[PDB]
Design a protein around this ligand. Structure first.
Ligand SMILES: [Zn+2]
Ligand SMILES: [Zn+2]
Ligand SMILES: [Zn+2]
Ligand SMILES: [Zn+2]
Ligand SMILES: [Zn+2]
Ligand SMILES: [Zn+2]
Lengths: 131, 131
């Protein structure tokens, strides 16, 4: 995930950490991980970097049930939706044109100019139920 | 909107005020409106009663983009999704089987025991363009 500004070891470290994992996580958890592996990088620095990348769209954003935003470097750059298990944190890339067509149809029927859609599905794995 | 607690003027007042308004609004906005109407009801009371109503299912909850939460009352008791214009705040309820079928298919394919899908979509309405 390239950054608009000059690359620095802190930005490179947070980018390497983002590509290292595949689950959703907020600024605090990733700050904990990077400090523990030996990065020594700031909280506000990672917050600003994540804001910048979200503006660039290289990563995705998702507001949890409480409200805090979590982030994930998705392999697929095209339009897509994520199926997330809160117990595991795993994200599965799922895309469907049916929901997009439905959104466009209802927007046209209501005469709305633009449509921004948030479609999140929260569930639990089969292994989660098992013990 | 019956409340599980005992009959009191606070619950009746907040329920009537919610029924009067048909727009998604935050707790502070509802508190200010109730104060202006002369209810003289507490903000913590508004929060507690609103949480109780949300748990009862008689009201529809929604999370704002920046992080706050807005709430609205919809006459229909059946499950439905909302189109909310951020510019005006007006919300209209709809229902389309396509999202349900896609969620069921995804759950069956991925083996998820249970899923909870949230589909709230945003778009500007006609009057925004009009000047
Ligand atoms: Zn993705
Ligand atoms: Zn989509
Ligand atoms: Zn799981
Ligand atoms: Zn509703
Ligand atoms: Zn509008
Ligand atoms: Zn649905």
């Amino acid at each position: 995930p390239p950054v608009k500004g000059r690359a620095t070891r802190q930005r490179a470290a947070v980018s390497a950490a983002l590509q290292e994992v595949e689950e959703f996580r907020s600024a605090q958890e990733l700050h904990d991980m990077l400090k523990h592996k030996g990065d020594a990088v700031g909280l506000t620095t990672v917050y600003r970097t994540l804001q910048s990348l979200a503006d660039a769209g290289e990563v995705d954003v998702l507001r949890t049930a409480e409200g805090e935003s979590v982030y994930r470097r998705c392999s697929t750059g095209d339009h897509h939706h994520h199926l997330v298990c809160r117990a595991c944190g795993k994200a599965v890339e799922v895309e469907g044109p049916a929901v997009e067509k439905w959104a466009e149809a209802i927007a046209a029927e209501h005469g709305y100019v633009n449509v921004a859609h948030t479609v999140e599905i929260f569930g639990t794995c089969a292994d989660c139920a098992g013990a």
